[PDB]
Amino acid sequence: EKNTCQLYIQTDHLFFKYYGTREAVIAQISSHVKAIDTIYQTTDFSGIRQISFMVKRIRINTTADEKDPTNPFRFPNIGVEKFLELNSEQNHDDYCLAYVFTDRDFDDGVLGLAWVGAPSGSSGGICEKSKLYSDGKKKSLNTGIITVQNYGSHVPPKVSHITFAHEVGHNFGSPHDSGTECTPGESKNLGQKENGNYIMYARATSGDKLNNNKFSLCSIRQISQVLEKKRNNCFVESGQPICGNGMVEQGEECDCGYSDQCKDECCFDANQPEGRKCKLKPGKQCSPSQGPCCTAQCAFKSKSEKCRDDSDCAREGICNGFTALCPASDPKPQFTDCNRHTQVCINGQCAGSICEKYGLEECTCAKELCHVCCMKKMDPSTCASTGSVQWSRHFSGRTITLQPGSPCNDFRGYCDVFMRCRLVDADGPLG
Ligand SMILES: *[C@@H]1O[C@H](CO)[C@@H](O[C@@H]2O[C@H](CO)[C@@H](O[C@H]3O[C@H](CO)[C@@H](O)[C@H](O[C@H]4O[C@H](CO)[C@@H](O)[C@H](O[C@H]5O[C@H](CO)[C@@H](O)[C@H](O)[C@@H]5O)[C@@H]4O)[C@@H]3O)[C@H](O)[C@H]2NC(C)=O)[C@H](O)[C@H]1NC(C)=O
Ligand SMILES: [Ca+2]
Ligand SMILES: [Zn+2]
């Protein structure tokens, strides 16, 4: 019944700076929610199935907001703890959860931060209200943050989506996975190690393995308790998409937002009467909310306009001149070198490693931890470097080094700009 959680997604100017336009970031937050939507719906939470998410409102900040003296997110150097405290200092009683997306390089390889939920005896996590806390601030602890930059390198959407579900996992009351039964990556068995760790793994994840996409036995039990005790206070029943969330969905022609948010002269905002709200205004044939192939003056862009830039294995996206959406770009040949000759292309996305290009698998070298050591599949004894004589027929003695922000040493840390595998664990006292 009450199985869907209404979200509120914000993006600062650094996130807008990376992607360029408001359409591109909206497509990012749409892709991120649809990612965690499929992960949670296909998870059996002790009998509670088909638990989903939905965006109730967005707030896309541009570089123009960086000069706002009342915007506390404008400072370039903001600590990850204070970044989440800024998100918490807002009233989010109208949303089950509230997230803010950024493109900051947090210290110690931190890719996100969120409050941990609990069935009782502890504040935070999913579905908290705005109340006075110990520090004297009226915070809403139903909040979390995510960043798409780590060690001066952007993280792919495959790892970004999992990180989004990781922090939401804490909001659902799941701690980090512990023990061999819930972290197969550190197991002494080749069968369980190939499947990788789970979503709530406390360290680095690649997203190219089986278990990295779904929760563990440890996490499902912990989340099922928070869902049994907390979701009923805030979740809503599955219904039609709401008008005014800034994303065009099924049943609406356009979607700019509400009155204090719609700057689109071609779309009725959500404050208009039923029958015309989220419906295309007369004389207008599209709205920028539908896609990038629509100008601000609400005309279809020409068949020569470039909508999506050329990626590592995703060709240019050219408009068709008849719809506001952009056609899906055709992918490049598979096993093509991407990410500076470090990874190959798997189904149109830069994933895996360069070892797969020649029928090999990634291995941990014997500081050479940020070098790529390949191995024959199922045989760990053949693990040699790319610049070795074994694979001299494929790599020809060249030594491929891992880019900054890549997993290293059996997913225990990340590589930095000085080619060092720095570990991620951080411990602090409890009150
Ligand atoms: C994206 O850009 C937009 C627009 O540029 C940003 O939106 C702005 O966000 C800021 C903060 O989130 C807003 O700043 C004021 O918001 C309220 C509007 O009146 C103010 O009340 C608020 O005052 C706060 O200041 C202190 C913060 O520590 C605090 O002492 C104040 O006290 C109040 O609350 C305490 C409990 O904490 C209570 O005990 C007191 O009695 C009192 O009620 C209060 O907390 C902010 O000064 C700003 O209005 C808003 N809009 C703008 C600038 O147009 C958005 O943040 C950006 N987001 C990102 C991710 O970049
Ligand atoms: Ca909508
Ligand atoms: Zn975590």
Any overview of this molecule?
This protein folds into two domains: 252 residues, no CATH class; 179 residues, no CATH class. The strands form six sheets. Strands 1, 2, 3, 4, 7, 8 and 9 form a seven-stranded mixed β-sheet that branches. A three-stranded antiparallel β-sheet has the order 14-15-16, with no helix packed on it. The protein is built from six helices and 19 strands. The protein is globular, with a radius of gyration of 23 Å. It is of the alpha+beta class. α2 packs across α4. A molecule of 5 linked components (NAG-NAG-MAN-MAN-MAN) binds next to loops. The PDB classes it as membrane protein. Keywords: adam10, membrane protein. It forms a monomeric assembly.
Keywords, separated by commas or semicolons:
7-stranded mixed beta sheet, binds calcium ion, cytoplasmic vesicle, 2 domains, globular, alpha+beta, 431 residues, binds a molecule of 5 linked components (NAG-NAG-MAN-MAN-MAN), 3-stranded antiparallel beta sheet
Q: What's the topology here?
A:
Layout: E1 2-11, H1 13-19, H2 22-41, E2 52-60, H3 80-88, E3 97-105, E4 112-114, E5 131-132, E6 138-139, E7 143-150, E8 153-154, H4 157-171, H5 190-194, H6 217-230, E9 236-237, E10 306-308, E11 317-318, E12 344-346, E13 349-351, E14 360-363, E15 373-376, E16 384-385, E17 407-408, E18 413-415, E19 421-423
Helix pairs in contact: 2-4
Calcium ion binds at residues 241-243, 245, 247, 249, 252, 255.
